[PDB]
Design a binder for this molecule. Structure first.
Ligand code: Y01
Ligand code: CLR
Ligand SMILES: OC[C@H]1O[C@H](O[C@H]2[C@H](O)[C@@H](O)[C@@H](O)O[C@@H]2CO)[C@H](O)[C@@H](O)[C@@H]1O
Ligand code: COC
Ligand code: CL
Ligand code: NA
Ligand code: NA
Lengths: 534, 214, 219
């Protein structure tokens, strides 16, 4: 009494699948397999996934469904002292869609650019080209491929910008794509999960339809088996490497979505006695299984490029947007029926990001709706005000130096923001709130207590797991740079301010809460550490 | 509430025979939440089958269970005398928790006639103001039996207390106790008392009497 | 291994209140949810209430709700059921039952403790010997008897010759009539052994603090 509920369970699942499954399943995982010694990478990947990844993924989902509230009120009602964790998590997600939605617009921009027999990015003789343009990927920095120059010199116009200090002109074609995106988002998150739960049916499922088509097309290409070899051929030499275990841990952590309060929010609409343990296992698996599949879709085509198109595999095998917006489209253009693959590819990229933005924004709305009945009373006006703020500020990413803006936030939005956020999530739950209570809560929901395996992971493994990542992360730290450009010192600071903006809420809200409660210190802790339940 | 009805209520079986019990719920029960308990006479219940198909530790494989929705069943492939008990199902699906009305499993044996003993009021009771005549019907099968008290020739109906024992764990027979209480003023006003037991074993009733002289 | 002992319970007058306890041992008690299940004299099982591992989730049946209160001591490993305004339909044997997992069920039960709610007054039984009648003295075997009449409440302890001979003995369950129990027991022995040796009915009714031995003589 009283909360809206899912329209039935597929909606929830596809909402969680759609959230967790995004461009990151296509553009980092397959690369890591290739780099880390292939099928061997699965060992550290799976271990990290089992001990670190799923237990944390499991945690938020159970926590969300149990406390029946958004991120802020949820931690407020769990550990009032740490209620800042809710605030931090929410505005981390708040920062993230100032940038992340630009990837979708890029996807939409290639989509409409792709409505022709002759794909613009296949040729070096165009107006935006330079004398250094190769037909395909090479080793040398100064000579870009054709697909690269289309992306940078035409779509992005990143060549006009000398850094983050010069953003240059606003591309209004790019701005139209961002707006179309927020439109799609709006009428999605329009009425809440009663609609949003419906729309994810397309956005979550569609990627698999296209993955199948590209899986079949790619494997029928000459050289496709050569690609799979680079992808999956095991070197267990890597298993002994620290960098390989760190890549496994990190990838597993960031691929599943804990720390944005999205799983918390989404699960909060579940029926109390719903089995969230079966949902957490099914959903986790599908997320990973998707990455594994997509790997074949990519490296199948990657091998084809090395075989038929004469390019060194190390040059075409890459991560980040470069893979999806340059390397892969370069291959599609050489194939017969190119236009078809192109159109469905870029729509896949779109639908891959969309259901992700849904959960991200939903984390904020649900969080604020439960804290402030004012904006709970009017949903339609709030999201309009939120997305308007997004779009206006997002005009910065539609500029000629937009990528420089994108790359800054990408690094600092939460890299370490969410890490320390989830670390305090694992600590608050397992120690402060206690595992005994937590297990008791889950039992009352699904009927049985968590296996003591999960309990150990939440208390010990997770914290050192997040620590293992955060330590090795700081150990290899180097100042922000993109390509040959090095970001200024003031820019790096602005990132740390964005990164620490969210995390600072935890200690801050603890102080303001500590000082707002009368009595002795030891008496003042106990009041703030006593759950809403008790 | 979710009402679990069981049938049959009482069930008789010869060892080695196959027995089946049914459990019907007024509302659908999650297959994972339906359980069975065996309770032997004079003892507390023991978890027997859980989550419909699962035998508890120490449960012979001769036991099985199956079902779903509103219909479940317990089955013993080859019955043993150590299986004679009352079996209750239960739903843990939702509160309030509910137990089935139970199925009582009893062993079948060969028909046996009762040995009828009759006893006069004790000397001690005859000083206290009351008088009660006791008649024991022992070691007979099946359980159903009918005692009839007679003072002299007349039949007496009111004022009786009948008690059956539980089925014996060895010979699997039954025994009953019938007690007729009177005032001695009413007892000492009649010279003859008869306890006759009608049972399936014989066409005519087994009679045991005495006179107040000896 | 795992043991659950129910204690307390006995006779109580309607509207009265009583406290039941269950001593848990052999497992970590804090880790398991406990429930009280009861069984009426008609042998019907009825779940009463459930309490969680940490007692933070409590469920009651609609019959006992507002009257019974279930509590938990995880330090001393004791389970409690506090009853109030007890009615006569609350008469039953109360079981301490453990289970954490709903998909498992109650995997351990105690020996139970008997609650009797009546406005009836405790009375001690009159134990009577049952001697046979003179003649014809068969031949082969003889059956003696003991009559325990007009007592309340249950139980009573009846053994033959201080429990030395348990064979051929039928002790009939007591029947309640007009707020008084009547119980009888029959024992059959060879005519060689009686009245050669002694046969004595041993009756114990702790409620009335009665302990009586009755020897059977062929008066
Ligand atoms: C989809 C493929 C190509 C990528 C890797 C998938 C599996 C290797 C990963 C996905 C999630 C992992 C699981 C995550 C959590 C569990 C539960 C865990 O089960 C228990 O501890 C039992 C205790 C209980 O049931 O309470 C054992 C490891 C296991 C099966 C892991 C086994 C390895 C798994 C299946
Ligand atoms: C890409 C190719 C190789 C495989 C395609 C995999 C597709 C068919 C898989 C991936 C995710 C799966 C879905 C995951 C979630 C659910 C919820 C369940 O309650 C109904 C089935 C449903 C909707 C699954 C249907 C099958 C599914 C859509
Ligand atoms: O201009 C012709 C040339 O450019 C087109 O680009 C479009 C763009 O995709 C639209 O979003 C919008 O901004 O108008 C642009 C042209 O002004 C096509 O992409 C290209 O194929 C076409 O030949
Ligand atoms: C930028 O952070 C993310 O991409 C995460 C998530 O994206 C967001 O949290 C998010 C938040 C706000 C706006 C858009 C996306 C989608 C998937 C699941 C975890 C991770 N991603 C792999
Ligand atoms: Cl992944
Ligand atoms: Na992912
Ligand atoms: Na997504």
């Amino acid at each position: 009494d009283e909360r809206e509920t899912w329209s039935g369970k597929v909606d929830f699942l596809l909402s969680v699948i759609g959230f967790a499954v995004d461009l990151a399943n296509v553009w980092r995982f397959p690369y890591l397999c290739y780099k880390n010694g292939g099928g061997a990478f699965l060992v550290p990947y799976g271990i990290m996934l089992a001990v670190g990844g799923i237990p944390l993924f499991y945690m938020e989902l159970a926590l969300g469904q149990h406390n029946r509230k958004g991120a802020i009120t949820c931690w407020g009602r769990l550990v009032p002292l740490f209620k800042g964790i809710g605030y931090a998590v929410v505005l981390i997600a708040f920062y993230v869609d100032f940038y992340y939605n630009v990837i979708i617009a890029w996807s939409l921009r290639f989509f409409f650019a792709s409505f022709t027999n002759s794909l613009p990015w296949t040729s070096c003789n165009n107006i935006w080209n330079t004398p250094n343009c190769r037909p395909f990927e090479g080793h040398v920095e100064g000579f870009q491929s054709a697909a690269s120059e289309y992306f940078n010199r035409y779509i992005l116009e990143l060549n006009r910008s000398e850094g983050i200090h010069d953003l240059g002109a606003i591309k209004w074609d790019m701005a139209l794509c961002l707006l179309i995106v927020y439109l799609i988002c709006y009428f999605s998150l329009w009425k809440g999960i009663s609609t949003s739960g419906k729309v994810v049916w397309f956005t979550a499922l569609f990627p698999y339809a296209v993955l199948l088509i590209l899986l079949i097309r790619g494997l029928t290409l000459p050289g496709s088996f050569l690609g799979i070899q680079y992808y999956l051929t095991p070197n267990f030499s890597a298993i002994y490497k620290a960098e390989v275990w760190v890549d496994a841990a990190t990838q597993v952590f960031f691929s599943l979505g804990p720390g944005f309060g999205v799983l918390l929010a989404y699960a909060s609409y579940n029926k109390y006695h719903n089995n969230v343990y079966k949902d957490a296992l099914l959903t986790s698996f599908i997320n990973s299984a998707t990455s594994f599949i997509a790997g074949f879709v990519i490296f199948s085509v990657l091998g084809y490029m090395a075989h038929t198109l004469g390019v060194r595999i190390e040059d075409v095998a890459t991560e980040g947007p470069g893979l999806v917006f340059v390397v892969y489209p370069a291959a599609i253009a050489t194939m017969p029926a190119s236009t078809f693959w192109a159109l469905i590819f870029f729509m896949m990229l779109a639908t891959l990001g969309l259901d992700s933005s849904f959960g991200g924004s939903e984390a904020i709305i649900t969080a604020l709706s439960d804290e402030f009945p004012k904006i709970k009373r009017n949903r339609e006006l709030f999201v309009a005000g939120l997305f308007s703020l997004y779009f206006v500020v997002g005009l910065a990413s539609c500029t000629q130096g937009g990528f420089y803006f994108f790359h800054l936030l990408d690094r600092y939005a939460a890299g370490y923001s969410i890490l320390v956020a989830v670390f305090f999530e694992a600590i608050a739950v397992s120690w402060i709130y206690g595992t005994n209570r937590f297990s008791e809560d889950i039992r009352d929901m699904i009927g049985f207590p968590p296996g003591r395996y999960w309990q150990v992971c939440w208390r010990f493994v997770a914290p050192i797991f997040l620590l293992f990542i955060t330590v090795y992360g700081l150990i290899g730290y180097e100042p922000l740079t993109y390509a040959d450009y090095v970001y200024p010192s003031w820019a790096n600071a602005l990132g740390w301010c964005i990164a620490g903006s969210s995390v600072v809420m935890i200690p801050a809200v603890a102080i303001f809460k500590l000082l707002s409660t009368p009595g002795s210190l030891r008496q003042r802790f106990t009041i703030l550490t006593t759950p809403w339940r008790d | 509430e979710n009402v679990l009805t069981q049938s049959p209520a009482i069930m008789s079986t010869s060892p080695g025979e196959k027995v089946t019990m049914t459990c019907r719920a007024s509302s659908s029960v999650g297959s994972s939440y339906l359980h069975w308990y065996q309770q032997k006479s004079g003892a507390s219940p023991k978890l027997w089958i859980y989550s419909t198909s699962n035998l508890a530790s120490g449960v012979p494989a001769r036991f099985s269970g199956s079902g779903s929705g509103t219909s479940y069943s317990l089955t013993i492939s080859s019955v043993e005398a150590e299986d004679a008990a009352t079996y209750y199902c239960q739903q843990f699906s939702g509160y309030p928790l509910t137990f089935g009305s139970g199925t009582k499993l009893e062993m079948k044996r060969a028909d046996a006639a009762p040995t009828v003993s009759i006893f006069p009021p004790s000397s001690e009771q005859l000083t206290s103001g009351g008088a009660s005549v006791v008649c024991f019907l022992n070691n007979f099968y099946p359980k159903d039996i009918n005692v009839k008290w007679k003072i002299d020739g007349s039949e007496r109906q009111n004022g009786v207390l009948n008690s059956w024992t539980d089925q014996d764990s060895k010979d699997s027979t039954y025994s009953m106790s019938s007690t007729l209480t009177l005032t001695k003023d009413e007892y000492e006003r009649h010279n003859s008392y008869t306890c006759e037991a009608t049972h399936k074993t014989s066409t005519s009733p087994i009679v045991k009497s005495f006179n107040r002289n000896e | 291994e795992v043991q659950l002992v129910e204690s307390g319970g006995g006779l109580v007058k309607p509207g009265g209140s009583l406290k039941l306890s269950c001593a848990a041992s052999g497992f970590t008690f804090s880790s398991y949810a406990m429930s009280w299940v009861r069984q009426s004299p008609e042998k019907r099982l009825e779940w009463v209430a459930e309490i969680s591992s940490g007692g933070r989730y409590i469920y009651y049946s609609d019959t006992v709700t507002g009257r019974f209160t279930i509590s938990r001591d995880n330090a001393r490993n004791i389970l409690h059921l506090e009853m109030s305004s007890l009615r006569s339909e609350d008469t039953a044997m109360y079981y301490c039952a453990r289970g954490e997992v709903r998909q498992r069920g109650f995997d351990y039960w105690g020996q139970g403790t008997t609650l009797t709610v009546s406005s009836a007054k405790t009375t001690a039984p009159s134990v009577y010997p049952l001697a046979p009648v003179c003649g014809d003295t068969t031949g082969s075997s003889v059956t003696l008897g003991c009559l325990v009449k007009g007592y309340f409440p249950e139980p009573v302890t009846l053994t033959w010759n201080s429990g030395s001979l348990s064979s051929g003995v039928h002790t009939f369950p007591a029947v309640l009539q007009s707020d008084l129990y009547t119980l009888s027991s029959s024992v059959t022995v060879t005519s060689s052994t009686w009245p050669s040796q002694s046969i004595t009915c041993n009756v114990a009714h702790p409620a009335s603090s009665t302990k009586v031995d009755k020897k059977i003589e062929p008066r």
